Amino acid sequence: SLYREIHQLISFKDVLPDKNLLPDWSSNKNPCTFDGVTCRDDKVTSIDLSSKPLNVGFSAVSSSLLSLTGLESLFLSNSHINGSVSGFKCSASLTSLDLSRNSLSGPVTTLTSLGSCSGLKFLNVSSNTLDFPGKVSGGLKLNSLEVLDLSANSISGANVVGWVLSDGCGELKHLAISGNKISGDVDVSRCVNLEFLDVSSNNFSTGIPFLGDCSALQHLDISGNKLSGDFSRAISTCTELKLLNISSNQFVGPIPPLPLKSLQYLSLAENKFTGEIPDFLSGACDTLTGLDLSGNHFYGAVPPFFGSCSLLESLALSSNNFSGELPMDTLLKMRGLKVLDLSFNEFSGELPESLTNLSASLLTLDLSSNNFSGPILPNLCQNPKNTLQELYLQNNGFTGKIPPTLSNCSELVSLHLSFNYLSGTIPSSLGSLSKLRDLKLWLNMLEGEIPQELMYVKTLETLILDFNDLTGEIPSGLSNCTNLNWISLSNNRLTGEIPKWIGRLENLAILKLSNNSFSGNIPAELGDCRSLIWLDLNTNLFNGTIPAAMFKQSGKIAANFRYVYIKNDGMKKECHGAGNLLEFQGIRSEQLNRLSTRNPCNITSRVYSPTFDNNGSMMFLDMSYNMLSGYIPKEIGSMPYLFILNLGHNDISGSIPDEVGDLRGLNILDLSSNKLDGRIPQAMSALTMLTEIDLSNNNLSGPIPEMGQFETFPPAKFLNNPGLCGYPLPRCDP
Ligand SMILES: *[C@@H]1O[C@H](CO)[C@@H](O[C@@H]2O[C@H](CO)[C@@H](O[C@@H]3O[C@H](CO)[C@@H](O[C@@H]4O[C@H](CO)[C@@H](O)[C@H](O)[C@H]4NC(C)=O)[C@H](O)[C@H]3NC(C)=O)[C@H](O)[C@H]2NC(C)=O)[C@H](O)[C@H]1NC(C)=O
Ligand SMILES: *[C@@H]1O[C@H](CO)[C@@H](O[C@@H]2O[C@H](CO)[C@@H](O[C@@H]3O[C@H](CO)[C@@H](O)[C@H](O)[C@H]3NC(C)=O)[C@H](O)[C@H]2NC(C)=O)[C@H](O)[C@H]1NC(C)=O
Ligand SMILES: *[C@@H]1O[C@H](CO)[C@@H](O[C@@H]2O[C@H](CO)[C@@H](O)[C@H](O)[C@H]2NC(C)=O)[C@H](O)[C@H]1NC(C)=O
Ligand SMILES: *[C@@H]1O[C@H](CO)[C@@H](O[C@@H]2O[C@H](CO)[C@@H](O)[C@H](O)[C@H]2NC(C)=O)[C@H](O)[C@H]1NC(C)=O
Ligand SMILES: *[C@@H]1O[C@H](CO)[C@@H](O[C@@H]2O[C@H](CO)[C@@H](O)[C@H](O)[C@H]2NC(C)=O)[C@H](O)[C@H]1NC(C)=O
Ligand SMILES: *[C@@H]1O[C@H](CO)[C@@H](O)[C@H](O)[C@H]1NC(C)=O
Ligand SMILES: *[C@@H]1O[C@H](CO)[C@@H](O)[C@H](O)[C@H]1NC(C)=O
Ligand SMILES: *[C@@H]1O[C@H](CO)[C@@H](O)[C@H](O)[C@H]1NC(C)=O
Secondary structure: OHHHHHHHHHHHHHOOOOOOOOOOOOOOOOHHHOOOEEEEOOEEEEEEOOOOOOOEEHHHHHHHOOOOOOOOEEEOOOOOEEEOOOOOOOOOOOOEEEOOOOEEEEEHHHHHHHHHOOOOOEEEOOOOEEEOOOOOOOOOOOOOOOEEEOOOOEOEEEOHHHHHHOOOOOOOOEEEOOOOEEEOOOEOOOOOOOOEEEOOOOOOOOOOOEOOOOOOOOEEEOOOOOOOOOHHHHHOOOOOOOEEEOOOOOOEEOOOOOOOOOOOEEEOOOOEEEEOOOHHHHHHOOOOOEEEOOOOEEEEOOOHHHHHOOOOOEEEOOOOEEEEOOOHHHHOOOOOOOEEEOOOOEEEEOOOOOHHHHOOOOOEEEOOOOEEEEOOOOOOOOOOOOOOOEEEOOOOEEOOEOOHHHHHOOOOOEEEOOOOOOEOOOOHHHHHOOOOOEEEOOOOOOOOOOOHHHHHOOOOOEEEOOOOOOOOEOOHHHHHOOOOOEEEOOOOOOEOOOOHHHHHOOOOOEEEOOOOOOEEEOOHHHHHOOOOOEEEOOOOEEEOEOOHHHHOOOOOEOOOOOEEEEEOOOOOOOOOOOEEEEEOOOOOHHHHHHHHHOOOOOOOOEEOOOOOOOOEOOOEEEOOOOOOEEEOOHHHHOOOOOOEEEOOOOEEEOOOOHHHHHOOOOOEEEOOOOOOEEEOOHHHHHOOOOOEEEOOOOEEEEEOOOOOOHHHOOHHHHOOOOOEEOOOOOOOOO
């Protein structure tokens, strides 16, 4: 017996490709001492080899492990098991089998073989590649199961649920098959003990699941399909219902009657429900902990009855047309509230003083994209121990100043005050927000300098201050913020140079400094930013030459890195640069016209990516409209991910490096308005991704390369080059 146990386990170990995996599994040694093994009274009862790259087929598993007498559970989640299940001798003692997150493949009918495990009651085969080929007939025939998870497979087809349940489901308590492409009907009316049903993210577009008496159902998730019928009538017999998730479908009309007496979580998000919030929902106030109505067509006010929902932790009403003043009278009674999301509505008026009390309970306050006005509450975080982590007030009409008292929201992780009409300075006291990761204040009328005090915020990742009236230089304090990964200061009136300490921000992925008055040379230390993929310096007063060293990472960039990209059309003179990459969270695109008084560019063309290992490269480089000079370092050509390169409008001379032809990712290439001479390198015919080029206003000569993409570009892209010829230009005179 021990003999048999140890021979089975060691035989399993020996079939493993990796010889480091079960280092302590050893023959002539008791398995009860092995890692991965659970024993009771010196007998093996469970094996857990999850998250270990075994790289063997199911046949090895069923041969060795599943035949172990007395084995009660086997956990092999994320263990690189492949192959298919099939017939094997299986212990009567085995009650749970977890094969999730593997590479099991073949028709789901293979699972019928697990019927040989007479004791099997729990089965997880989620996140594999099981499918259902053609004719959906017969049955799964595992009607002893209490729990079955077939989620995230490759099951495509109609009435697969009927197939799962055809042979009986009187024992079933938990059915999940989410994340497939199943369609048709769901009939669980004979599953009288079913407590959990998840058919979400599938291809259901016809009937609502038929639940029958719905006598044990507590959790119902049909979200992420295309359903439109009468779910209300479907769930009306479900008196045990705690979670109802019908989000991301195609339901319409007003919120219908619902079974409210046991309800904890309700989501109707992402449908087309209309009307006001009806007062009958009040019946769930004894139990309701989470409510989500986001992304519908609701309107009107927030009903006073919400005052009695004392257990409500989360109220999400974003993206509707709710209106009126902040219903503080009601919000104050919601003892339990931690998340309040009213963003993307039409709430208006000023912030009430009572709101300050909420700083004491909420973790998240989201009022972004409404019609609020007036000052931001000076006293907001006045309470002894405020919990507030996220404060989103962006895209409103707030006036006045940023209250220094926000330094008292001690747990603040994210502060978004962008797209308002705030004036005054950036309070130095935000320096004492020791956990702050995101500071976003762009598109306001902020003045003064960038607080040196930010140097106290070690956690800082995001500093977005575009479109203000900020002056002075980049404070050396920012050098201490080594987790900065996104710095954006475009469209201020800043001065001075890029500090060389810039080099020691190994996480900086985006540096946008356009339309200021920065000067001096480009620091070669820029090449020491191990994360830099987006460098925008257009429209400044930079000078000197381009440092080859700034490219010395093209390189071992580990990985890649919520925004809007607004492309410059090329029909406006006063509009400079390839285009603006701007932070765009909780902001309506409709309000982008608010830039009209700051930005000479049109705003019509709004846009919202590769994968790296250690191959990653700079993706975006724009240094146009400066006073640069010298020669383009041929290292310029070392960036296979560079899809944009704008060096237009400088005083760059010498010839175009042939290495430019190595930039296989290049879509845009602007080198117009410079002192460039010599021949356009033939190598540039290798580029096949170009959508725009400009080499006009240089001193280029010789023929335009006959191959590549040149012929597809108009004469304009080549004008003002005396000795240049060849189509699209006039034929060269040999
Ligand atoms: C770098 O930054 C500076 C400073 O922000 C920026 O200069 C500013 O640019 C804007 C846009 O060109 C100017 O626009 C002001 O406001 C309106 C836009 O709504 C301008 O255009 C029209 O104004 C008339 C007024 O009667 C109006 O009827 C019309 O509807 C407007 N057209 C629209 C809808 O676009 C005005 O010309 C102008 N108003 C004033 C103050 O006279 C700002 O004035 C500029 N502010 C300055 C110069 O400090 C500059 O363009 C940026 N550079 C780059 C390359 O982006
Ligand atoms: C079948 O196997 C699946 C794959 O393991 C299970 O899916 C996983 O279940 C976990 C529990 O729900 C999830 O845990 C995550 O990690 C933390 C750990 O502390 C949890 O709190 C979170 O709920 C969850 N993620 C976070 C951070 O929110 C796994 O995420 C989840 N993975 C998925 C969904 O693919 C199934 O649960 C299992 N089925 C059954 C019936 O047991
Ligand atoms: C799920 O959505 C619908 C419904 O099954 C599928 O649309 C079908 O498209 C095929 C053509 O490939 C037609 O033969 C079917 O008649 C369509 N269905 C109907 C009723 O119009 C869609 O293909 C399915 N998606 C997947 C990936 O399974
Ligand atoms: C209700 O259903 C939605 C849609 O299935 C769930 O949202 C999913 O997970 C997150 C949001 O939490 C998003 O990524 C998507 O909207 C959904 N899935 C994916 C992978 O995109 C939501 O979590 C469900 N709510 C509950 C509590 O069950
Ligand atoms: C870039 O701008 C700076 C600051 O205005 C200038 O610094 C120049 O540096 C070199 C030193 O040999 C010379 O061009 C001048 O002596 C400096 N000018 C002055 C008085 O500041 C200069 O305009 C630009 N620097 C470069 C590299 O040309
Ligand atoms: C299972 O994985 C191994 C390891 O790569 C491979 O050799 C074998 O062909 C795979 N079997 C199937 C069914 O793909
Ligand atoms: C939203 O509500 C406001 C205030 O009642 C109303 O004036 C406006 O027309 C509504 N907007 C839409 C899109 O229905
Ligand atoms: C950051 O600046 C330097 C880093 O070497 C040093 O004075 C100190 O460690 C830091 N200062 C602060 C504000 O912690």
